[PDB]
Design a protein around this ligand. Sequence first.
Ligand SMILES: [Cl-]
Lengths: 94, 94, 94, 94
Amino acid sequence: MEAVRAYELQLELQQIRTLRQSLELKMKELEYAEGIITSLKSERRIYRAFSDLLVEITKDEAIEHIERSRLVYKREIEKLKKREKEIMEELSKL
Amino acid sequence: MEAVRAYELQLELQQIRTLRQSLELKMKELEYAEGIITSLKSERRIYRAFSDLLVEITKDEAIEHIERSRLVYKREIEKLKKREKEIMEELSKL
Amino acid sequence: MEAVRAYELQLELQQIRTLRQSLELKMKELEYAEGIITSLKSERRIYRAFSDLLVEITKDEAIEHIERSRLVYKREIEKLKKREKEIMEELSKL
Amino acid sequence: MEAVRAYELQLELQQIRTLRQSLELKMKELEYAEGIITSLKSERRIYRAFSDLLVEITKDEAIEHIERSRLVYKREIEKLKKREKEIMEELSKL
Ligand SMILES: [Cl-]
């Protein structure tokens, strides 16, 4: 019945939204970090986490990481939002 | 049957409690950190985590973060506890 | 039927084991850290994590934290292992 | 029916794949860290995470940890991939 087709579209939508929201959080945290790293205070040490190690990196390396990561996240988020878009439309047609 | 209505209220209550407890933990960890940061020892470096980066911050920045975060958590916790309150009352009326 | 009573005891046992194993992991990680902190190398900075902040602590503070945490974990682990013990015995009697 | 036997093989395969992928991620993160640690920049502080403590370690200690961890992960990954191999073959024979 339509109720079942809708529930399954809703289940898919929730899973996509959950993945998408996790990526936006990480993306926003890195943008916040970029604002601090590029602020006026002269010295701020920065570390990058790799599994269970924290390795010191430079301001330039940190900015590079933030910019590349944002690109990967923006792309993944755009793709997921377009899938959410399609599903919301199907749900609307029902 | 009442058993089913109760089970569904119980399911909702557990999910709210789980979210609430996660927030109280983070809130209490930051209050503990504040006590240390404002203690007598002269020098303690502090870092703030943003996704996979750790960025050095000052004592004043750390205290600001702790106070703002506590406000956000206290508010979210109060709202969830009020929802738990309502549900516990419904469960009692049944 | 006995199969159902056994499945439910098995479900409970798995959940207890999962909680217990998580605590033993954290406990063992802190014991490993203690071995390093008390080793010969003269200077090793140490930080303690509180939610999203890392705060510098001394060797003595780190050892204190490790010892107290081990006590809390050992106690929680002993209590869970005794519950696992009871269940395994019930499963055996069936 | 074959559909049910296949679903159960698929369920097992997904769980194995999920464990395997988690290990490959950690393994790749440590290999990335090794590349940075052994790069030209003269001074980079390194910390290792043990539960809620971060303890400073040397470049040599970090490399040792990365190499041992890779061995443990490579072995666990090879064993899981061989189990995935078997299941994919069963699924093919059905
Ligand atoms: Cl440092």
